[PDB]
């Protein structure tokens, strides 16, 4: 049911200007269904775009195709992973002959690793893995059409992501050991998201858990479907107003560093209380080398009280607890940080994200169905340099 559309130099410039002015690094997906007689990739349209982008001095990274595992369903064309690998080798040759000869190339943007997708990924990495800078794959927990509120709160649903990640690394370790692995498109639910769920506070359990697990398990980059657009998994709605996952994303960015550590809860029950630990983001002007950022999800229906281990038990902790603004509870599209509603100051001005210092040596309170960050000040962790 999908039809070809054209796009203009204008559309390219709109896209590039938006990325450049926002401090984002653009990755442009090229059309992989442009084929020759013998089902080789026909690169002639890509050549026109590479030439235009070159002429404008655009610093752009490239992909080729989206979920090639479903090409037969979408376009009645089957491309096997071997051929797709060869297609990527042809794109790599074009990039090498372009003005940006060191441009990065990512792919193949396969869906999650069902048997047929795992096979396509393996044959793609055998054939084409030498020319890609990172392996991209996609993940969704649920079908947006059928997802329920209980699904969004169910640790058995959250835990399925662990097996997807293990299956992708099994394929990569067998073919291109040590190649970086990226989530190239990911959200709560596919088909544009779960109405009244994917755009709410309740979406944040899946998003924060995905980020925690991705970092813990060796995924280097997670690309959230979608910043803005059709489908209520957007971070920003049709009025350009931020939803709870935008605020969660911003707080994650301000507090959580690049060095991943590990946290776990003593006792046999690790399902409903979910904990993650990184070095604190060093760019945060409040904090200093050696500080830790803990983040936690409470899917229990009662408050839990977390005790930090020696030698962190008596440190100053800053709390950053997210709760919904009423009256719609977890189905709210508004969130409070430490009891203050998060809202733009104006169209040009994000608000401060204000910490709540806890009394040194107090347990960390995490209300039912909430998530929070906790910065451990003067943690002096050598690993965090």
């Amino acid at each position: 049911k999908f039809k070809n559309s054209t796009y203009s130099r204008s559309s390219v410039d709109v896209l590039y200007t938006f990325a450049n002015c926002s401090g984002l690094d653009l990755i442009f997906g090229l059309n992989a269904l442009l084929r020759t007689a013998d089902l080789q990739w026909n690169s002639s349209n890509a050549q026109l775009l590479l030439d235009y982008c070159s002429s404008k001095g655009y610093n752009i990274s490239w992909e080729l195709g989206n979920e090639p595992n479903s090409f037969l369903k979408k376009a009645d064309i089957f491309i096997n992973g071997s051929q797709l690998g060869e297609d990527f080798i042809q794109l790599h040759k074009l990039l090498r002959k372009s003005t940006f000869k060191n441009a990065k190339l990512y792919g193949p943007d396969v869906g999650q690793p069902r048997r047929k997708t795992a096979k396509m990924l393996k044959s793609f990495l055998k054939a084409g893995g030498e020319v890609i800078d990172s392996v991209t794959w996609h993940h969704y927990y649920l079908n947006g059409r059928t997802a329920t509120r209980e699904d969004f709160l169910n640790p058995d649903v959250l835990d399925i992501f662990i097996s997807s990640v293990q299956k992708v690394f099994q394929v990569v370790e067998s073919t291109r050991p040590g190649k970086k692995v990226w989530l190239g498109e990911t959200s709560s639910a596919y088909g544009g998201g779960a109405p009244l769920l994917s755009d709410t506070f309740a979406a944040g359990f899946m998003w924060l858990d995905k980020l925690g697990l991705s970092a813990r398990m060796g995924i280097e980059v997670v690309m959230r479907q979608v910043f803005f657009g059709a489908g209520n998994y957007h971070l920003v709605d049709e009025n350009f107003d931020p939803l709870p996952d935008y605020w969660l994303s911003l707080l994650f960015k301000k507090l959580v560093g690049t060095k991943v550590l590990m946290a776990s809860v003593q006792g046999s029950k690790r399902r409903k209380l979910r904990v993650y630990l990184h070095c604190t983001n060093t760019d945060n002007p409040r904090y200093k080398e050696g500080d830790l950022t803990l983040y936690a999800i409470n899917l229990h229906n009662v408050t839990k009280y977390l005790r930090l281990p020696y030698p962190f038990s008596n440190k100053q902790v800053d709390k950053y607890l997210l709760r919904p603004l009423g009256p719609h509870g977890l189905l709210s599209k508004s969130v409070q940080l430490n009891g203050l509603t998060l809202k733009m100051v104006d169209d040009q001005t994000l608000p401060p994200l204000m910490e709540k210092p806890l009394r040194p040596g107090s347990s960390l309170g995490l209300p039912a169905f909430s998530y929070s960050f906790f910065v451990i000040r003067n943690a002096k962790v050598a690993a965090c340099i």
Binding site: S10, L30, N66, K74
Partner: protein, 74 residues
């Protein structure tokens, strides 16, 4: 009693994520919206986008494989 003890591993980094670890998409299909220029030119939207820098912006989606560059189109 609802109290829970945490264990921390702090010896060394287990992994290093990109500074751009939390990245975002714009779906290829948005380029088929007549208002694409108005939407991505929105100062309010750009303020929110700048808030998540540094990040990758993946321009891609199902429509990736149904889009053709036409250098003559206005």
């Amino acid at each position: 009693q609802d109290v829970v003890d945490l264990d921390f591993f702090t010896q060394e980094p287990l992994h290093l994520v990109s500074p751009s670890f939390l990245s975002v998409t714009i779906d290829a299909n948005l380029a088929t919206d007549p208002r694409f220029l108005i939407l991505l030119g929105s100062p309010k939207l750009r303020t929110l986008a700048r808030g998540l820098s540094p990040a990758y912006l993946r321009f891609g989606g199902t429509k990736t494989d149904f889009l053709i560059f036409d250098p003559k189109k206005e």
